[PDB]
Nucleic acid binder design. Structure first.
Length: 399
RNA sequence: GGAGGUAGUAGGUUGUAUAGUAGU
RNA sequence: ACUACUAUACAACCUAC
């Protein structure tokens, strides 16, 4: 219930007040101080169940599939607290030992294990005091209750006392409907399809992955050729051929890599913010053409979160546990399901958001925008006391 | 590395429901 | 009413991407 650096918000302090001596999942939106409220309850954790006693202690652990989030939460969040912090990624017996009491709070990947009374599970909804982390109506309520039963969860932290601090810190993303009519160019359609048909008919796991990567790149460049003729067509073809040729040196792959580069370039010769797409070649072509015409992971992240990069391309695995500073908006090309998943990474200062693309319109309105019925299902599960949760977990423990 | 999980699509099988046709 | 075939929808399992 304490504060690491910034003053704790009223919504984050009320949600972590009942989690001191209790155990349960805590869900907070980006920009609302999620990780800030995590160190809050963690400060009162080791200061109660562990301290004053030196012998008995609780080592906070973090289980996440992303290796970049291990040192992340262990520096701007865990290290800011008065308690010790540490990061271990790919022995762990020295940091988890209660005798030395060195680096209590830890973070890493791939998870005596019962010696720690405080345990945290990051992204546990996709599957001692256990604390979880998360972002039809009968199917959603049954899945959330089953995860909270075996996952050792009772009280769910949410906005109750003050609901104004929720939308104030995290601004709602504006939904902008954009339906471009450019998809597949009918003019000279057999010329662009000749290279994709010749590459697919030229074909174990290495040969199939190279053919699937060229087919996915040609399909992404086909829709990008309608918007920009020679911009994204020559950029995606040259980057895909150079990456396959520089990955390995072989006489069999040299004929397919050299021929795909010369044929695609000759046929296509005729003429801060966040982004998510399946192919990174289309995002690099749009950012490269806009900035020209009027070991690498450390240098790229240094120029991204600092504000020097106006465009950032992420992936499906990189869409969670991210931090963006001065984000103008978030766009998606070809990637309430993905809505809150992509926007849940980081918070943007501007509430306006656009999506690059007959389609959607009333069709996407019924499928998406499920937060209306999801609000009643999430509120009913978070308001359940420990009486109904105990009987559900005890009866299902035999399975 | 390795690997599992998640999500979508396609195919096959099984169960249920509905509609149509045929037989008793 | 029962049986068989076909089509659609839902659920489960397996395989592939």
């Amino acid at each position: 219930m304490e504060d690491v650096e910034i003053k704790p918000r009223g919504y984050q302090l009320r949600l972590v007040d009942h989690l001191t001596k209790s155990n349960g999942i805590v869900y907070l939106p980006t920009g609302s101080g999620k990780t800030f409220v995590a160190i809050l309850v963690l400060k009162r954790f080791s200061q109660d169940f562990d301290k004053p006693i030196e012998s008995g202690g609780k080592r906070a652990l973090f289980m996440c599939n992303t290796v970049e989030l291990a040192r992340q939460q262990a520096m701007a969040v865990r290290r800011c607290t008065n308690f010790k912090v540490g990061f271990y990624v790919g022995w762990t017996r020295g940091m988890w030992s209660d005798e030395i009491k060195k680096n209590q709070v830890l973070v890493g990947t791939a998870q005596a294990l019962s010696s720690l009374s405080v345990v945290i599970i990051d992204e546990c909804h996709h599957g001692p005091r256990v604390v979880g982390l998360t972002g039809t109506n009968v199917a959603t309520k049954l899945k959330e209750l089953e995860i909270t039963y075996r996952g050792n969860i009772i009280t769910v932290s949410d906005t109750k006392e003050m609901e104004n601090v929720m939308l104030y810190a995290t601004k709602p993303t504006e939904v902008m409907v954009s339906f471009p009519h450019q998809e597949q160019v009918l003019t000279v359609t057999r010329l662009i399809s000749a290279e994709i048909e010749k590459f697919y008919v030229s074909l174990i796991y290495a040969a199939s992955i190279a053919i699937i990567s060229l087919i996915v790149e040609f399909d992404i460049k086909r829709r990008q050729a309608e918007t920009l003729s020679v911009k994204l067509m020559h950029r995606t073809a040259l980057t895909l051929c150079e990456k396959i040729r520089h990955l390995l040196v072989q006489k069999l792959q040299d004929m397919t890599y050299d021929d795909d580069d010369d044929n695609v370039n000759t046929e296509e010769v005729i003429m801060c913010c966040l982004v998510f797409v399946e192919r990174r070649y289309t995002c690099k072509c749009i950012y490269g053409l806009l900035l020209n015409y009027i070991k690498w992971q450390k240098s790229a992240i240094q120029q991204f979160r600092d504000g020097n990069a106006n465009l950032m391309i992420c992936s499906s695995v990189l869409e969670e546990g991210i931090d963006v500073q001065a984000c103008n908006h978030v766009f998606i090309l070809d990637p309430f399901n993905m809505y809150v998943q992509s926007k849940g990474r980081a918070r943007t200062t501007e509430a306006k958001f656009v999506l690059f693309t007959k389609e959607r319109e009333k069709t996407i309105q019924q499928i998406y925008q499920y937060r209306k019925a999801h609000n009643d299902i999430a509120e009913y599960l978070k308001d359940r006391v420990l009486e109904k949760t105990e009987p559900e977990l005890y009866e299902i423990k035999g399975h």
